[PDB]
Amino acid sequence: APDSVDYRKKGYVTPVKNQGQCGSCWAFSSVGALEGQLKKKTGKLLNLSPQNLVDCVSENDGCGGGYMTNAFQYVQKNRGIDSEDAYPYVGQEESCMYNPTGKAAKCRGYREIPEGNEKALKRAVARVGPVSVAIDASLTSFQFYSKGVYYDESCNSDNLNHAVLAVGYGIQKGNKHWIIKNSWGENWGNKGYILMARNKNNACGIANLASFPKM
């Protein structure tokens, strides 16, 4: 795998979104990975509907949390996911209003990265594209992050509480990192993104719950 990869430079990533107060990060993480595979497979980049996932993935708990794997399986079994325009995000759980005429992408299932294996995650990102991951983003340092390779000695690898998207990886002044797209709006972090320490003992559990959709 190359030393550095950034899918934003390859047009695989849509603009940063804001999940609002709803604990739907898993939905934005899933949609992010799907948009990446859609661009790679069809050459079209478009916003997919996280609200579609929040309202219809009964395997998850809507704004109460969920897993990306359940989201990918839902898309596969549902035979599609709507575009953001066909199923607008409202930041609150509502009855399922999936509309197949608004179908914008499909899923053949998913694959999981070996738990805690950052080398396997790096390989996946390089070969597949953006990968969905979960991290411990509960710290003060994470909320007020602005620049540099994020690292907090208090990060809990066993306390995954927030899903995000790994759109690449690289190195800054010798410091290896993961390029992470968050869903807290463009004012948060560095235009909505954060560089997180890579190969630093699986900091914040970055490689503990990584998966991507097959398309």
- Helical H runs in 57-209? 68-78, 118-127, 140-143
* Listed residue (27, 32, 26, 30) closest to 13, CA to CA: 32
For residue 25, indicate whether it is catalytic: yes
For residue 182, indicate whether it is catalytic: yes
10 to 83, 130, 139: CA distances (angstroms)? 21, 11, 31
For residue 177, indicate whether it is catalytic: no
Structure tokens that stand for 119 in this block: 């080398």
157 to 137, 146, 200, 203: CA distances (angstroms)? 10, 22, 11, 6
The active-site residue out of 60, 70, 78, 182 is 182
Q: How far apart are the first and last CA of the chain?
A: 21
The active-site residue out of 25, 56, 107, 155 is 25
Q: Which residues of 182-215 are buried (b: 16+ CB within 10 A; e: fewer)?
A: bbbeeebbeebbbbbbbebebbbbbbbbbbbbeb
The active-site residue out of 60, 162, 177, 208 is 162
Active site residues: 25, 162, 182
